[model samples]
Each structure stands twice: as C-alpha cells, then as structure tokens.
Target chain A: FPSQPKSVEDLLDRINLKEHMPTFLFNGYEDLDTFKLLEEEDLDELNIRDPEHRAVLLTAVELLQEY
Target chain B: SLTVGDWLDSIRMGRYRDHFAAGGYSSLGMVLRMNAQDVRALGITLMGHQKKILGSIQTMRAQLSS
Candidate 1:
C-alpha cells in the first residue's frame, strides 16, 4: 500500500533525519507506522530539544491521524 | 535584518539539518525572544555556542536599536 502513504519521511525529509532528529531514527522510528505512535514524552526522551522543531513534528503527526 | 538561516549558517550550526528542517530559519523571531535559559532548552550547554548565540542576539539588538 505504497509502503505507508505519506510517512514521517514525507514530513521530516533528509534534514530531519540526518540532523534534527537522527536519534528518532536511531531509536527505531524507520517510518510513519512507528513514528506516528511516538508521544510528546517519547520525543522529549529522544532529546528533540527545539520547541519549534518539536511543534512541527507533532503537527505533522496530527496530520497523519487519519492514516 | 538577517534571516535565521544566514545567521545559523554563519555560526556553523546550519549544516546540522535538524535546525533547518525544523524551520530554524523562520524561527529567527523565536531566537529574539529566547533568553539564555530558553536557549538551554535546546541543549546548547557549551560556552562557545552560548557566546555565539549571545553575539547573535546582540546583532539583533543592534539592528533593533537602530
């Protein structure tokens, strides 16, 4: 099914993974299926420190709610 | 009126990808409001990076003062 339509990869991009939240991927996020399940506390533990960055990711997660 | 992207690039922090992907460029406004404590939330504990950010704030301050 298109390998999880509009996954975290769509929102995060290479920059998001390579730099901003490499730990997310390192923590086994891989794609939307698991990434979407991450909570605010989870992100915090991952050290997603920047507030704006955090907000953007959370917003993207919400957009994928229907998925 | 420097864009956050340019500022970050100048600081060598631009290549991190996380800041850029997180809209750090557009977040120049956020930086303006950030005190040292606020910046610490980003995990920038190094004295050098802190000094550089304080410098950036000074640049913003000078621009505003003008």
Candidate 2:
C-alpha cells in the first residue's frame, strides 16, 4: 500500500504519500540508494514532501511486494 | 581508531570475525545491508561496535547495559 498509497484509506494523508513515504506499521519498504541523497541533511527534519524521496519510497514498496 | 568506512568494508568483506575480540570489534553479520540512518544511529566504529539508536531504545539500552 505504501508504494501507491494514493488515498487516506491507505496512508495517513498527513504524511504526503506522494513524496515522504512515512514509515508505517506493517510497512516494510525502505531503500538506501534511492534515499541516499537525504544524508545531506538529518532525516529527522526532512518531511516526506520531497519528490525523489517519495519516488524512492514508492519504489521500495513496489520492489518489496515483488519479492 | 579506525574509520567507519574501512570498518564497514571489512564487515562487507566478512573478513574480521569475533566482534569484541582482543583487537577486533563485533561481527559483520550483526549489522549489514542496513540503511545509512539505521547504520548511523547504530553507528559502528572503525573497530565495529554500535554508536546510537532510534527505535527500540529502552530494550536496546537494557541489553547493552547488561
């Protein structure tokens, strides 16, 4: 659901599923290479509104489901 | 003290075993292929031990203290 968390029914909506890809319960999609750029800053401050981050998050969800 | 970069390579290479040995630190299998933030939080030294953590704080603290 995280990869295409397109609605509040899937995501918290507050997390901006299009970008942030907030870590959620039962969610197991996370990628280092995709979100590596985030290291430029502390991830604690960066919300899930960034575009590339979101893409990576979605990619995590998609990739995990495939396995 | 060794740097995290070289130490991590040793772990990736699976050469240095016996984490916390006389000269070596911890094992690579203990922490590998993890995210950078998680790795940073768990923070290993060039020697191969943990630094800090975010999740499971209380339990990890208790475990470490013991």
Candidate 3:
C-alpha cells in the first residue's frame, strides 16, 4: 500500500473500479501520467458515462495531487 | 556544467540536495525523466515542494526536447 499508485491498474484498484481495467488499458491509459490527467470529458470518452462513477473516479484522481 | 546542487540552489530548493544525493539523482538527465512518483520517492512530502521540483523538471525536459 504505497502512498501513490504505481500503475493505472493500481489506481483503478485504489478507487475500487478494477473491473474497468480492460477499458482503461485498451484506451492507452496504461501510463500513470496519462491516467492522472483524465478529466470528466475524458472519462466520458472512456465510456464511463455514469455520473456517480465519474464523480468517484475524478475524486480519486484529485487525491493524487497530494503526492 | 550546471550541477544538480546548483540547479536546486537556482530554484531556491537547496534544502533538497541531501535528499537528491541520497536518492542518487546527480544529473539533470536523470531528473528530466522523473514523474510525480519519482519526486515523491525522493522524500519530498510537501505538495508545494513536489510541484516546484516536478515543474522545474518539466521545464528542463521541454527545453532539452526542443
């Protein structure tokens, strides 16, 4: 349990959305920097169109600012 | 011939010389590729410190890549 995620998969697991692993990887979000740069529109492009899901994912992404 | 210590001093971040030395970051080339995680690993716990260092690295990367 490191303070920051080591990879995209680790980030997904951190947010409890490990199920979206395939979608994230397939869309070239394998790099943590790319993953960290995701915005709401980017999440929509990733097909994570649900409001609740987007909120959760974005909140998790925001926490990376602390690292 | 801009050493890492000098670079740190230029940025007013001379305090991190020991941390950078301990983390084996002796060259601008090495720091050029460092991301947020690598900066964090250098024991820069403060968000402000992390941002300043990473921002400086990004500036160097852009200049060198250009």
Candidate 4:
C-alpha cells in the first residue's frame, strides 16, 4: 500500500464517503479500531439503511482491515 | 439560468431536497447573496457537506462571472 490511511477521516475521504460524513460523525464511526469490531447488524442500528451505502462501507472496511 | 434545484440536482448526493432552497438560494438571483458563513448558517450541519455546498456555489459564481 503506497498510502496507508492514518485516520478514519482520511480513509473516508479516500473512499468518497463525503455524503455520509455527518452521519458517520454523529454515530461515532471515527476510527478503524471502532469499525473493525462492527458487524452488518451494527449498520442497521446506525440507521445505514441504504443498500449501496452499506455495501460500500462494508467493502471499505474489508479493505481497510488489510491495511 | 441554473436554479438552486438545478445545482442541487447536479450533485451526486442524496435527499438534500430543498435544503439550500429552504436556505434562500432558491434561484440564481439569490445565489449571489449567499456567503460561506450564511451557507453554514443554513441547516447543513456537517463540515464536509458544508464545504462541498460552498465549493459548488463558488464554482457557480466563477462560471457565471466568466
């Protein structure tokens, strides 16, 4: 990885998660550490009801885990 | 000639129906009166979304000026 992200904001911005920025902060999804422990079910609790947005987040988390 | 709806519609984000329109930039005429602080004072609470909206407005200004 040429550019490993240093923070949740970095990763979110890198992934074009700008639209979810408010909701992400409002729900405290502020770090990879917090995200690593998240499940798909957790997203439901977080009000992430959009299918495509959920998939993007899940896929991003999967990739971030490798970094 | 771009309405605020036109600008909002051009953005690839969601569900901002009437967010800026409600803020007073409902038409091209009102867009000129919008400042960054005024835009922030609108109901948009997120920094990222705020910046994106401000940036789009600036872009519109530049295009119109040119």
* Top candidate (DockQ): 3
- lDDT score at residue A36, model 3, on the 0-100 scale: 61
Each candidate's clash count = 1, 5, 0, 0
Candidate 4 local lDDT, A4-63, one digit each (tens) = 877777777887777766666665455455554456876777677888888888988788
DockQ for candidate 1, C-alpha atoms: 0.02
Off by over 4 Å in 1: A1-6, A14-18, B1-66
Q: What does each candidate score in C-alpha RMSD?
A: 15.6, 12.1, 11.7, 12.1
TM-score of each: 0.41, 0.22, 0.49, 0.46
> Candidates' lDDT values, in order?
0.60, 0.35, 0.77, 0.66
Candidates, ranked, lDDT: 3, 4, 1, 2
The local distance difference test score of model 2 is 0.35
lDDT of 2 by residue, B1-66 (tens): 243335434324223233323233344233333343544343233211221112223333455564
Off by over 4 Å in 4: A1-67
- Could you report the DockQ of all the candidates, in the order they appear? 0.02, 0.02, 0.04, 0.02
**Candidate 3 stretches greater than 4 Å from native:** A1-67
Winner of 1 and 2 under TM-score: 1
lDDT of 3 by residue, A1-67 (tens): 4666888788888778998888877664665555665678777667788787889888977877665
iRMSD values, candidates in order: 13.5, 11.1, 11.2, 7.9
Off by over 4 Å in 2: A1-9, A12-16, A22-44, A48-67, B1-24, B27-54, B63-66
Between candidates 1 and 3, name the one with more favorable DockQ: 3
Worst 10 residues of 2 chain B by lDDT: B47-56
